[PDB]
Amino acid sequence: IWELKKDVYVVELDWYPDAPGEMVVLTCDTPEEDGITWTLDQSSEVLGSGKTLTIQVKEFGDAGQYTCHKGGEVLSHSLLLLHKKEDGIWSTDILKDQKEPKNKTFLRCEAKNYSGRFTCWWLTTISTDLTFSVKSSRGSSDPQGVTCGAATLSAERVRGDNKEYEYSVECQEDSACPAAEESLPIEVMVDAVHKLKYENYTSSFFIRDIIKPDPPKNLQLKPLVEVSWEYPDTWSTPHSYFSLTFCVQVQGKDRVFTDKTSATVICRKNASISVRAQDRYYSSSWSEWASVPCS
Amino acid sequence: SPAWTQCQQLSQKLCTLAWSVPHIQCGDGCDPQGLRDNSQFCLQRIHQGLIFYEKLLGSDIFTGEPSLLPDSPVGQLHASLLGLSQLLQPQPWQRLLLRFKILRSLQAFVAVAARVFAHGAATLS
Amino acid sequence: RERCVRNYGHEFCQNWYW
Ligand SMILES: *[C@@H]1O[C@H](CO)[C@@H](O[C@@H]2O[C@H](CO)[C@@H](O[C@@H]3O[C@H](CO)[C@@H](O)[C@H](O[C@H]4O[C@H](CO)[C@@H](O)[C@H](O)[C@@H]4O)[C@@H]3O)[C@H](O)[C@H]2NC(C)=O)[C@H](O)[C@H]1NC(C)=O
């Protein structure tokens, strides 16, 4: 048993059928010593007496809010949650598997530049009694500061009664160093609580590996056609340092790979010129396409 | 000074060879402004990093089972790293995980040095 | 240990003798 927040404790249980629980000794936090009784949830049944209570936490019926009383005087509270370990693997029932990139991806994170800011998102099919808590740091040996906002709902898909929810969060590294080669990874930790079930998720990464630039801006055509564009506004600066390479595509395909901000290709009827961007010196993700009618 | 254009080419060949431990950190002055103010300091830290990678590339680390193939691009890294080094200043069972971490680390290192050579060729030359 | 393809990919593991 260990303390999540104040008066909130997590009990680790191997969800083996007919397994033993954990022997837990709750203590009433009060100067009183006599006439103490214990109850659980909205029930009036006394489960024991004394300044301390001992319980065998095996199932979710043993979890929840324990209150200790002196008659009608309410004294203190203790919330118990369970962390399930089935097959030796902590439970991952609150979050859904996004399946991309790897298989068991519950948290997906992404950056648009080297500033130290990034966004993580995740998916769930749970609509009630759901709480998320997000923390982050660079390195475990000495946690260097990363500030995270609060997880907020960003998308939902409803198919009758099956509703799927997407939460996102934004984080920013305190003393970021955009040009430096990162030696330690960023860890993002997400606590997920659903009723009395506690889970947590962690994703470890380098900013350079989650880079996905914004699409090229100001895609323009000039016939003599000269295709011209500019760096996205959100890409790191100076561009002579944080260089981008581009892929220009013609499709009703012809592809041209250039480090330059302009290129020349032929234009067919009812075709389209599309450009995407990528970090020139590190194979990051390709940007999304910017397109314009071949006309 | 160090003929930035040639450094750009040798570093670009390193990037391409790698896409198939020393680190450039903040205090190294390899940021854009740090290049302008003291390019000697940054290129000194790059050089020492390349020398260190050369040594790893020829060690008991890249020998043994699973054996390195002669066609492998990994086998050409020691070459490209050594050329750039002159241009500046003229493991029992699972070796597999450590070879990986070294290669992924070298992609990150060469990416930063390439930005250095690109930026110095555009501003310091 | 050729199952490394499921840990580092088929391109990286193609560098070694199995
Ligand atoms: C994600 O979930 C995992 C699964 O539970 C969780 O791992 C647990 O973390 C807690 C938090 O530290 C560990 O609890 C510790 O247990 C050791 C016994 O080995 C204690 O010595 C520790 O002492 C602290 O707390 C005491 C009272 O609670 C204090 O007296 C003391 O001064 C310390 O403050 C602490 O209790 C627990 O052992 C692990 N479980 C496992 C299996 O490792 C993990 O922390 C979760 N992630 C996050 C970000 O919360």
Q: Which one of C4, C11, C17 has the shortest CB-CB distance to B69?
A: C17
Q: Are B115 and A282 in contact (CB under 8 A)?
A: no
Residue written as token pair 């060949």 = B13
Q: What is the pairing mode between strands A226-230 and A217-222?
A: antiparallel
Task: Please state, in angstroms and rounded to a whole number, the distance separating the CA atoms of residues A74 and B101.
Answer: 57
Physical contact, C and B (3 or more Cβ pairs within 8 A):
yes
Is A85 a pocket residue for ligand 1 (Cβ < 6 Å)?
Answer: no
Is A2 a pocket residue for ligand 1 (Cβ < 6 Å)?
Answer: yes
Cα of first residue to Cα of last residue in chain C, in angstroms, is 8
Task: Please state, in angstroms and rounded to a whole number, the distance separating the CA atoms of residues B3 and A21.
Answer: 70
Q: Are A248 and A260 in contact (CB under 8 A)?
A: no
Question: Å from C3 to nearest chain B CA?
Answer: 11
Which residues 219-278 on chain A approach chain B with CB closer than 8 angstroms?
A: 238, 240-243
Question: Å from B93 to nearest chain A CA?
Answer: 25
What distances in angstroms separate CA B8 from CA A249, A283, B95, B116, one per listed residue? Answer: 27, 17, 32, 9
A204 forms bridges with which residues in the sheet? A187
A137 forms bridges with which residues in the sheet? A145, A187
Is A3 a pocket residue for ligand 1 (Cβ < 6 Å)?
Answer: yes
Q: Are A279 and A213 in contact (CB under 8 A)?
A: yes
What distances in angstroms separate CA A269 from CA A252, A273, A294, one per listed residue? Answer: 8, 11, 7
A159 forms bridges with which residues in the sheet? A162
Residue A25, both tokens? 């000794």
> How far is C-alpha A73 from the geometric centre of its chain's CA atoms?
42
Helix (H) or strand (E) holding A65: strand A64-70
Cα of first residue to Cα of last residue in chain B, in angstroms, is 8
Task: Please state, in angstroms and rounded to a whole number, the distance separating the CA atoms of residues A225 and A219.
Answer: 12
Task: Please state, in angstroms and rounded to a whole number, the distance separating the CA atoms of residues A156 and A133.
Answer: 20
Residue B47 Cα to ligand 1 midpoint, Å, equals: 44
Method: X-ray
Q: How many H-runs (helices) and E-runs (strands) does chain A carry?
A: 0, 23
Task: Please state, in angstroms and rounded to a whole number, the distance separating the CA atoms of residues B117 and B7.
Answer: 6
User: Is A281 in the B-facing interface, judged by CB distances under 8 Å?
Assistant: yes
Q: This structure's resolution (angstroms)?
A: 2.4
By C-alpha distance, the chain A residue nearest B11 is: A281
Q: What is the pairing mode between strands A52-57 and A22-27?
A: antiparallel
State the DSSP code for C4: G
Can you tell me whether residue C7 is helix, strand or coil? Answer: helix
The CATH number of whichever domain residue B113 belongs to comes to 1.20.1250.10
Q: How many CA atoms lie within 13 A of B88 on its CB side?
A: 24
Q: What is the pairing mode between strands A254-258 and A22-27?
A: unpaired
Task: Please state, in angstroms and rounded to a whole number, the distance separating the CA atoms of residues A219 and B113.
Answer: 30
Residue A108, both tokens? 């997906």
- Structural domain of B38: 4-123
| Atom of ligand 1 at shortest range from CA of A189 | 49
Q: Are A280 and B110 in contact (CB under 8 A)?
A: no
Which chain B residues are closer than 8 Å to C8 by Cβ? 96, 100
At A22, the amino acid letter reads E
- In chain A the domains, ranked by start, together with CATH numbers, are 2-88 (2.60.40.10), 92-210 (2.60.40.10), 217-293 (2.60.40.10)
What distances in angstroms separate CA B95 from CA B18, B26, B60, one per listed residue? Answer: 18, 30, 9
Residue A42 Cα to ligand 1 midpoint, Å, equals: 29
The pairs formed by C12-15 with CB atoms below 8 angstroms and a separation of 24 or more are C12/B20, C12/B100, C12/B103, C15/B20, C15/B68, C15/B69, C15/B72, C15/B73, C15/B74
Q: How many domains does chain B have?
A: 1
Q: Are A64 and A80 in contact (CB under 8 A)?
A: yes
Physical contact, B and A (3 or more Cβ pairs within 8 A):
yes
Q: Are A201 and A211 in contact (CB under 8 A)?
A: no
Q: Are A246 and A275 in contact (CB under 8 A)?
A: yes
Q: Are B120 and B38 in contact (CB under 8 A)?
A: no
Q: Is A38 exposed, middle or buried (0-12, 13-18, 19+ CB in 10 A)?
A: buried
Is A209 a pocket residue for ligand 1 (Cβ < 6 Å)?
Answer: no
User: Is B16 in the C-facing interface, judged by CB distances under 8 Å?
Assistant: no
Residue A62, both tokens? 């043993």
Can you tell me whether residue A130 is helix, strand or coil? Answer: strand
Which chain A residues are closer than 8 Å to B112 by Cβ? 179-181, 281
A276 forms bridges with which residues in the sheet? A247
